[PDB]
Every structure is written in C-alpha cells, then in structure tokens.
A and B are shown apart, each in its own frame.
Chain A
Amino acid sequence: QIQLVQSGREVKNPGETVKISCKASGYTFTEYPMLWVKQAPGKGFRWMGLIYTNTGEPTYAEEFKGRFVFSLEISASTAYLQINNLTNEDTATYFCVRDYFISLDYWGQGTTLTVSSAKTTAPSVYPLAPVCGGTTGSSVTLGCLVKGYFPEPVTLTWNSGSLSSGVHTFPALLQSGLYTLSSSVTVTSNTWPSQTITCNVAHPASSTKVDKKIESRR
C-alpha cells in the first residue's frame, strides 16, 4: 500500500542543496495526493503538502517557504522534497503520506537531510574484540567501530550483518563534528571470532569504504 521509502542522508553545504526523493510504494493514480511532511527537531509533524504517486509533484508546504519545494518521479509512483540553498537549520526528517487508508494513510518514516559545516573524512572502522584471551561463550563479542565520518554519512555495522544478530551498537557521538559509532556484533563460538566476524563501514564523502575484522582479542 502507501509507504514512501524516503532517501537516506542528504548531505548539504552552507547554501548547498538537499534532495530527498522517496520511492513511494503504492503510487496510485485515481483520486488522492500523498501528503508530504517536513519534520523539525521537536515539532512532530509539519505537512509539506499533498502530492500523489502517479499524481507526480507536491503541492508544497505553506509556512515552509525558503528552501523547500516538492517534486517527484510520477510514473514510478515516487515523490520527493528538494530544498536547495541550505541554511543552518536544514537538518530534519521527511515523509510522504499515501492516501489509502483514506486519510494521509501511508506515512513516511522520515528521510534525514543533513546540511552542515563540518570535517572532511569518510568513516574509519576497526575490529572490536572480546576479553583478550578467549572472550567467547554462547556469544563471542566481536564487532566493528566506525568513527570519523564527515560529511554525512559513515555507515558501519559489527559483523557485517552475517555475524550481526545479537549485536549491541552504541550510537553516533559527536566529537568536534566527528561522528563515532561502534557495533559489538555477537557471534557464536563457531560464529565469531572463533569463526569469521568482521564489521564494515562506508563513506562516499571520501569515495571510500573500510571494514575491520571483529575477531577475538587474541
């Protein structure tokens, strides 16, 4: 049904652009738009208009004048919010709302537009081990620590999703504008790091990617 799969990190510069195209599953044609929504830090909902999937373009927000303007790929059922001329407070969430469940009944989960001045380096990931001899049991605490992402994003997981189940990941903390994260991926005794365990990370702001092997600390 209606569900706008919003875009990921939309990186913007000071006065730079933002573009969150959300592939709207459930792009219909008949009788109703898809109510777009901007999302501020506290405001909850802030509606960015109505614009259909096979309708095609958004009838935009009212008080959101400035950067924001709606767009979309109409034949694919997909919508989008493009906000060029990035100001300071451009970091926010984005949603569509597909008119099935006859209100704005396919709410977008949010797309993260990040337009800010910060450091220039894609994220660097490393292996994070258990206790230094063994450090294994019914779980075995490998993982990948991906820190140092600038601009957004640096995407890092611990055990890479294969040895990813049963993982505890600490969130991105800011250090002078440096985004750090770690994911302790629990493998088995045969899963990792006795078996193969390896966290991964990526950063196209440097046009690069790096993974660190989440083995035991031996």
Chain B
Amino acid sequence: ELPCSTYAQSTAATAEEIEVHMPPDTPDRTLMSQQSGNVKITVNSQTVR
C-alpha cells in the first residue's frame, strides 16, 4: 500500500470553501407582454428591472 493522495468522501465544509457571492440578476424577456400589439406589459411577481 504505497502512500498517495485521495479525494476523500467526507463532505465537511471545514478547510474548504466556495465563493458564495451574490446571485446575478436574471435577464427577463418573458415578463412584459405586447397587449394587442401594443404596451400592455406584465410583471408577474419579481424584481423586474
């Protein structure tokens, strides 16, 4: 048994880290509708920029 490395199966998040930064704002082409061909647009429950 020669000693080598091994990516071990302990899933402990101590001595390891992810860069949990802020979630980016999603692009939203689905929100506002063209009511009849014209501007009757909708939000439908988000921070719609």
Residues of A within 8 A of B (CB): 2, 28, 30-36, 47, 49-50, 97-100, 102-105
Contacts and interface: CB of A to CB of B under 8 A. Distances in A.
28 contacts: A31-B39, A31-B41, A32-B35, A32-B37, A32-B38, A32-B40, A32-B41, A33-B34, A33-B39, A34-B38, A35-B36, A35-B38, A36-B37, A47-B37, A50-B34, A50-B38, A99-B35, A99-B37, A99-B39, A102-B39, A102-B40, A103-B35, A103-B37, A103-B38, A104-B36, A104-B37, A104-B38, A105-B36
B31 to A, nearest CB: 12
B32 interface: yes
A97 B39 contact: no
A47 B37 CA distance: 9
B15 to A, nearest CB: 53
A2 to B, nearest CB: 8
Contacts of A99: 34-40
Interface residues of B, number: 9
Contacts of A32: 34-35, 37-41
A97 B36 contact: yes
A34 B38 CA distance: 6
Interface of B: 32, 34-41
Given A31-B32, A99-B34, 19 more contacts: A28-B39, A30-B39, A31-B41, A33-B34, A33-B38, A33-B39, A35-B36, A35-B38, A47-B37, A98-B38, A99-B35, A99-B36, A102-B36, A103-B36, A103-B37, A104-B36, A104-B37, A104-B38, A105-B36
Contacts of B35: 32, 99, 102-103
Nearest to A98: B38
Contacts of A50: 34, 37-38
Contact of B37 (A28, A30, A31, A35): A35
B39 A34 contact: no
A50 B41 CA distance: 14
Contacts of B37: 32-36, 47, 49-50, 97, 99, 103-104
Nearest to A33: B37
- In the complex, the 9 A-B pairs of residues with the closest C-beta atoms, listed nearest first: A99-B38, A35-B37, A32-B39, A103-B36, A31-B39, A104-B36, A102-B40, A32-B38, A50-B37
